[PDB]
Amino acid sequence: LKAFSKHIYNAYLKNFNMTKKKARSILTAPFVIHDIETLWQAEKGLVWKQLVNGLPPYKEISVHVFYRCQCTTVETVRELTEFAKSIPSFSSLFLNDQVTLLKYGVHEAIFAMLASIVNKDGLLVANGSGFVTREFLRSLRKPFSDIIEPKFEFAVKFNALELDDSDLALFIAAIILCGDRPGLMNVPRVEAIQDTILRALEFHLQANHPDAQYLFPKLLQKMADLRQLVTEHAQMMQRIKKTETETSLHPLLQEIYKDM
């Protein structure tokens, strides 16, 4: 049982480059991106460096941030996919279920993970090297500003729990191995596996956070909140996909948002 929680926490460490430990040690010399000038200064890309001339028109600023939001999540989706392979019993499931579980579960896992790299004034980006301000994300266009702002307000509430990476490791495994996803075939086997993980998390929270009662149902509450947050996010993404014709979506993201 204890080795179960350390197996997942092992895989978490093995698969996710950015951790809450490394994140909070940075947050408490990142290059601050607070305007169009500093946003462009974050480059280092040799091809980008060879092509840059001046500052971008206006519409390019929001598409660029929207492009960086895609890249962030795409990388994290591929990490979460490996992470899931190491979760006990996940690989024994039907490959369809494995895909279905990841399809509807990755964003919920991401937004909980991304709370680690966030505070009330902004978030860490680009391998912890830069810090994008909240004000700048308010200064973008409405469609792209209205999808970033709900996340900040959730992240600060999630960070009030004062969890660590060993808590997140199990918590994320619980989000992925979720029973009530559309089209999920072998439901009993997934719920069974989730109970094992839920039983592991219940023990871990008591062994890691002694003097903070009622913390488990709090985390269960956040799972329902992560669903509603993603439910709104996906809707705002599809409204964007409809209206924003000069905007496209990464092939990995296209899959996930196909049939939601």
Ligand SMILES: Cc1cc(CN2Cc3ccccc3[C@H]2C(=O)Nc2ccc(Cl)cc2Cl)ccc1OCC(=O)O
């Ligand atoms: C357009 C889009 C926006 C966000 C919003 N994300 C999730 C999130 C959580 C907590 C704080 C800030 C955020 C925000 C985010 O990652 N922003 C972000 C990331 C990198 C850079 Cl360089 C700049 C910014 Cl503004 C998330 C997904 C997405 O679409 C891609 C996808 O759904 O996969």
